[PDB]
Design an enzyme around this catalytic site. Structure first.
Site, mmCIF file in Angstrom:
data_model
loop_
_atom_site.group_PDB
_atom_site.id
_atom_site.type_symbol
_atom_site.label_atom_id
_atom_site.label_comp_id
_atom_site.label_asym_id
_atom_site.label_seq_id
_atom_site.Cartn_x
_atom_site.Cartn_y
_atom_site.Cartn_z
ATOM 1 N N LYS A 92 11.559 61.773 22.999
ATOM 2 C CA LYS A 92 10.326 62.423 23.522
ATOM 3 C C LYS A 92 10.015 61.825 24.897
ATOM 4 O O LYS A 92 9.259 60.857 25.045
ATOM 5 C CB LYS A 92 9.161 62.406 22.498
ATOM 6 C CG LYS A 92 9.531 63.147 21.254
ATOM 7 C CD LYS A 92 8.573 63.162 20.088
ATOM 8 C CE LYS A 92 9.139 64.193 19.084
ATOM 9 N NZ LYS A 92 9.401 63.910 17.695
ATOM 10 N N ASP A 95 7.471 59.957 30.839
ATOM 11 C CA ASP A 95 7.349 59.054 31.980
ATOM 12 C C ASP A 95 7.095 59.920 33.176
ATOM 13 O O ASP A 95 7.063 61.151 33.074
ATOM 14 C CB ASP A 95 8.603 58.157 32.143
ATOM 15 C CG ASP A 95 8.240 56.726 32.590
ATOM 16 O OD1 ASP A 95 7.470 56.617 33.549
ATOM 17 O OD2 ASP A 95 8.699 55.744 31.988
HETATM 18 C C1 U5P Z 1 8.506 64.787 16.444
HETATM 19 C C2 U5P Z 1 7.261 65.205 16.834
HETATM 20 C C3 U5P Z 1 6.289 65.263 15.864
HETATM 21 O O1 U5P Z 1 5.208 65.690 16.112
HETATM 22 N N1 U5P Z 1 6.530 64.915 14.600
HETATM 23 C C4 U5P Z 1 7.744 64.466 14.254
HETATM 24 O O2 U5P Z 1 7.958 64.125 13.084
HETATM 25 N N2 U5P Z 1 8.749 64.370 15.239
HETATM 26 C C5 U5P Z 1 10.134 63.975 14.867
HETATM 27 O O3 U5P Z 1 10.541 64.965 13.892
HETATM 28 C C6 U5P Z 1 11.231 64.373 12.773
HETATM 29 C C7 U5P Z 1 10.377 64.355 11.486
HETATM 30 O O4 U5P Z 1 11.352 63.937 10.522
HETATM 31 P P1 U5P Z 1 10.926 63.878 8.946
HETATM 32 O O5 U5P Z 1 9.533 63.371 8.860
HETATM 33 O O6 U5P Z 1 11.094 65.322 8.495
HETATM 34 O O7 U5P Z 1 11.960 62.955 8.363
HETATM 35 C C8 U5P Z 1 11.536 62.952 13.271
HETATM 36 O O8 U5P Z 1 12.791 62.919 14.001
HETATM 37 C C9 U5P Z 1 10.358 62.624 14.203
HETATM 38 O O9 U5P Z 1 10.751 61.723 15.257
HETATM 39 CL CL CL Z 2 4.909 53.555 34.618
#
Ligand code: U5P
Ligand code: CL
Lengths: 257, 257
Positions: A92, A95
């Site tokens: 994500k 920056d």
């Molecule tokens: C990204 C953004 C967000 O708002 N919520 C999130 O959970 N994520 C990413 O999605 C995946 C969720 O995985 P799980 O909870 O289904 O195992 C994970 O890669 C998180 O970084």
């Molecule tokens: Cl910075």
């Protein structure tokens, strides 16, 4: 006023990467993105191959891949081409513009060289988009903006979400959609991808909150479910992926009419 | 009443990482953090050695380091111990707790294994902190929360900034301060580090905005300036580092009285 994925692939203002995704979604009857949250290449590739036919997209997590090499990504690209899915890197980006440019293009990972899609936070302002675009535009890459988050206490709400939508509109040559919990744009050229999805109610111990495919796709109007642990933790990951695919696809069909 | 860095290092509620940093800032008369925005290990290690005596901290950019290895980080730590500065990895962690935990501990970079300090965006809610702290606390590390950003159109304002400060207060066993453009907390146990610093007025062509050492340390009440290009792009990097060190230090002394 709901259109099929295949019809959306033909919209006049559609980005080529979005059109490619929408066409394979329609062809394969899948709006499932696998979140391949695993630490080893062998597992990533085995899941990619086995679940490839069931998914429209695989979300990589290269920052956790203990044995990353570019050759692993070459093999993933082979599977993506074979089974027909896009590669979306989780990172994500968040920056200033000049920084995210280098983080996208370079380092050991060289993310732009293999990822069809990346995502960015909008908190820095639109420079985040502009930086990523300088790298990804000529590579025919696309970007999703993080308009809402699934976690408890998320500050991506209200005016913040609206800022994300405006930013996407203003950068439609490169921004193809959103990470969000619901439909946030009325423009059908934009894709909505929703993480925080499981068949069962609950969450985790670190602020993740889950909603079902039927809720997210059917009632909240999103396009694609992003599923990690709901699939990854299952004994049979293929069976799990099929259950998630059917749930998401049929919720989509039901909103079509 | 403003306390000196040396006195703040001794506060009962000070975090050990912050104490170590404050003590060496006072000892070496430096409140300058070098942003080591370079692509090659040789360049990172050369700047660390040449500029080590002038800085309290080196901000690494491991996501852009083309020839990263753990041995490079072993050698950087040796320089940090010799010259006495902390290592602060730039990566702006910005994901759910379960994910940032793994991004911090794992992958090829193993950031927690060599960075004294990391920083996180607060947008996901407090799970981002809880997740990082699960890895950082055993490893005796500290974290900074991004309360404000230096870039044009930043959404890290108002209630967002206030939320960052509350999150820091509630996680003071791990959070040692803020990335911000100004003092955002009145608690002297918290550090304030400010990027977007140059001696002259201006910006970059991707939304970065600049303020001077005197403005950010003296008028705005921050503790440490973070400087990349202002030093690195100068013909004489040692002289430039010394100009920024002297500027930041004198601004601090003047505010102190
Ligand atoms: C990204 C953004 C967000 O708002 N919520 C999130 O959970 N994520 C990413 O999605 C995946 C969720 O995985 P799980 O909870 O289904 O195992 C994970 O890669 C998180 O970084
Ligand atoms: Cl910075």
């Amino acid at each position: 006023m709901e259109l099929s994925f295949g019809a959306r692939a033909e919209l006049p203002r559609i980005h080529p990467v979005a059109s490619k995704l929408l066409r394979l979604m329609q062809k394969k009857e899948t709006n499932l993105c696998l979140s391949a949250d695993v630490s080893l290449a062998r597992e990533l590739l085995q899941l990619a191959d086995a679940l490839g036919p069931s998914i429209c997209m695989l979300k990589t997590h290269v920052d956790i891949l203990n044995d990353f090499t570019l050759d692993v990504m070459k093999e993933l690209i082979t599977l993506a081409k074979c089974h027909e899915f896009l590669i979306f890197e989780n990172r994500k980006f968040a920056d200033i513009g000049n920084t995210v440019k280098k983080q996208y293009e370079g380092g050991i990972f060289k993310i732009a060289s293999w990822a069809d899609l990346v995502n960015a936070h909008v908190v820095p302002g639109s420079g985040v988009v502009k930086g990523l675009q300088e790298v990804g535009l000529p590579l025919h890459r696309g970007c999703l903006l993080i308009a809402e988050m699934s976690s408890t206490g998320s500050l991506a709400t209200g005016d913040y979400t609206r800022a994300a939508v405006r930013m996407a509109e203003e950068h439609s040559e490169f921004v193809v959609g959103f990470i969000s919990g619901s439909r946030v744009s009325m423009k059908p050229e934009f894709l909505h991808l929703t993480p925080g999805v499981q068949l069962e109610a609950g969450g985790d111990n670190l602020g993740q909150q889950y909603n079902s495919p039927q809720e997210v796709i059917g009632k909240r109007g999103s396009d694609i479910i992003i599923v990690g642990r709901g699939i990854i933790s299952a004994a049979d990951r293929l069976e799990a992926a099929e259950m998630y695919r059917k749930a998401a696809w049929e919720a989509y069909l039901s909103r079509l009419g």
